[PDB]
């Protein structure tokens, strides 16, 4: 008279299938990308242009000597 099945206490667990979490898609991407990339080239032309100014100063000390 000592046998298994309980009178109660059950679930069940699902048979389902779901993890579609979105996700920042669909014109949200391709907009943060271009907005990041244009910040890069804007951070250029303030350094590459400025290094071009110090470049001429480096040639300047050459030319003021050599006679």
């Amino acid at each position: 008279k000592q046998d298994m099945p309980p009178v109660g206490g059950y679930g069940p667990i699902d048979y389902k299938r779901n993890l579609p979490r979105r996700g920042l898609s669909g014109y949200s991407m391709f907009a943060v990308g271009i907005g990041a990339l244009l910040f890069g080239y804007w951070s250029m032309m303030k350094w590459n242009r400025e290094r071009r100014r110090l470049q001429i100063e480096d040639f300047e000390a050459r030319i003021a000597l050599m006679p």
Partner: peptide, 9 residues
């Protein structure tokens, strides 16, 4: 810019 960078003397 590229014209007035003196190379020579």
């Amino acid at each position: 810019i590229n014209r007035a960078t003196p190379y020579n003397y």
